[model samples]
Target: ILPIDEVNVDGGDFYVGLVFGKEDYAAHANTHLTPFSIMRTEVTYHQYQALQAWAETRGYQISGGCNGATFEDCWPSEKDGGRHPVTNVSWWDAVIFANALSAQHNLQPYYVTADGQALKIPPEEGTDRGIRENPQASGYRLPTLAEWQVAARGGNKGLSDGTYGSRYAGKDQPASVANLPVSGTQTFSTLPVASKQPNSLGLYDMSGNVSEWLNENYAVKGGKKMYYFCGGSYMDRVGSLASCDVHTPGFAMSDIGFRLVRPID
Candidate 1:
């Protein structure tokens, strides 16, 4: 099971105005205070592999490289790397693992199969796949758009004190704290979690390594469809690691993955 720790939430404030335009339209303008919290240092390959193992025991197979692999087989990267976060996971897989972990912990599960639909909801549903339900159970889930920003900012201000690093608007500091395809270097494909540095809240990998997934759905103004993914991945351009600026098409690559969260009751 994945271990979790309670951490304090704090930090800077930013505006998230929605744009509503054609093709690249903007939505309604709205702003809220971003809260902070303790996030996973890194999504280690072993951790992901463990989830795969647990799922297989339940007759569920996680498609991709994690299948049929032991802990040792799932390294951080292709080159004997075990510390890095696991990639190639779809959004559905992440929810499965999260639900499994919650059940193992005897905590209220968050995902449920209802009306032929696998719905992800709070624990009060009773029909949830998790365990004991509580105030925490309701909060336990994936990080929201506001919460992600709070964690990424590290509760700081100005260019230098922010979480992504001071040099490049907190967007292009992966070289210093994460593993990615930068301009000149490529050491480890996926380094160990917290291998570089932690943000203000002591969370790691907020910028590079793997683009994180948020809970909000993206919609372009006046556009018929909507989909969204946050954070820049290890393969992203260094300059694209800013706040909520980076996003991907829902039906895109697996370089993007997500972490789970539970609100403090």
Candidate 2:
């Protein structure tokens, strides 16, 4: 009963073979996934703040709020309603946000330290790149690469309608499913969530708005570990929506955001 809209994706096995930016190394090994509930849209600034306020006083130090933008200059505040997806949040921040949502709902947190305790603020900030996730735990968390593949392709319906193999996420055409960039137009930021059509699963913004963060770490290069994410951003037109990509978990960008999911069982 979180104050967010979500859809329960029925569990089933599916083949994942698409690769856009980086090769889908994780999908090659795992194709089947259990039933889970995914957020209908990217986590909006309004929604992030609502839960962040509750999480703040409880010792859960969530980051990436308004950054340097003033209270009114920010996209939207607790006072003014806004539906833009929360940006400038690192992958670690997303993990912490998921745990905070789980904690507030009296569910077990999914991310933990090596000692298996719930991860909290400040102490976990620097070393969060290697935090472990418990898929068995009844808590909200980032979708695994395999799970993201299935959901982005529109779940079971996309497989049947041929949308699964299309270049975009929900439909064969990018314009039908995403808020992609247009040539010669100077784009400043992302559009409101769900501005485009949803896929067969009734999930919105799976292809555009912003690239989403995932749970799996891609690799460690030069002592810096990178995690995987999927979908294309509004700024990206040539990138395939279903393509898997990787970035540093500690670095936050305006074109990157995330959604939440929890195992049904």
Candidate 3:
């Protein structure tokens, strides 16, 4: 088991607006949200490797190489010592991992081909051609950009619980809740998950540890498809915590990682 916390968010209407200096596409997600469960911390390397090892046995395909090294060799740690959020994962990697996770728990996989096959691999990493999403599926998947933003603000209940409208996940400043750069010097390393304070909903590393991938929006550039990512990374300044941005689906970086969410009826 991953041994992580899953926080349940009660559904409600949330006003998605700009987070002052961290404006991006997520700021426009003004809609009613459904009940869901989100990981309280970013997926740690330990959890990722556990699921990935299991995924390989089930014929799940995962493209790896974290910033030029084998994903496993990028950071050497004891089998259970890797508690830092897993990094250098692309949007596609996140999606594939979600499916493996869903299947492990006997839940329906969310991403599938048009003909309904579990989405183990895409015909092309840059195309959504045969891809389909079962929003009602009881499975793990990347949170939408809207869902991410709302959750970062502490969800609907958080709006009234004094956890709303903060620049960072748990506070207006990054010192108490983030693992960002110190005095503009990039750390080039991720801290252990939950090493910092959590948001009002008890979500840790939502502000800074590593930027996260979102499944809601995508764009095409030069005939290549790109996906959205949010928050900031340990290498960035405090102003990016609430930001949302895009990149090619295959683009991975040492500063990018992801979290997972499961829908609730």
Best by TM-score: 3
Which lDDT value does model 3 have at 41? 85
**Candidate 2 structure quality by residue, lDDT tens digits, 1-265:** 3486889998777766654322333345347788999999999887787778888788887898541112223454442355787878888789889989998888999999767878775343456555667767999999988778788877777766656666677777777788766567565456677878898888988887777899877876575678887787766564566566788777877677899999898
For 119-238, candidate 3 gives per-residue lDDT tens digits of: 887456445666888976899999987788889888765676655767788688887898776675633566778888888988998988788898866755466677888888776554
Candidate 1, which segments miss by more than 4 Å at Cα?
10-38, 59-62, 65-81, 115-139, 156-174, 186-188, 220-227, 238-240, 243-254
Task: Give per-residue CA lDDT, model 1, range 50-126, as digits (tens).
Answer: 76677677654444433111222334244445556666665555655666666656656554554432233322323
For model 3 the TM-score comes to 0.88
Top-down TM-score ranking: 3, 2, 1
Candidate 3: regions farther than 4 A off: 1-4, 20-29, 65-73, 125-127, 184-186, 238-240
- Which is better, 1 or 2, measured by lDDT? 2
Could you tell me which 10 consecutive residues in candidate 2 have the lowest summed lDDT? 65-74
Error of 2 at 80 (Å): 7.7
> How many backbone clashes does every candidate have?
24, 0, 0
lDDT of 1: 0.50
State residue 257's C-alpha deviation in candidate 1, in Å. Answer: 2.4
Q: Report how far off residue 118 is in candidate 2 (Å).
A: 1.1
Q: What lDDT score belongs to each candidate, Candidate 1 first? A: 0.50, 0.75, 0.76
Q: lDDT value for candidate 3?
A: 0.76
Error of 3 at 24 (Å): 21
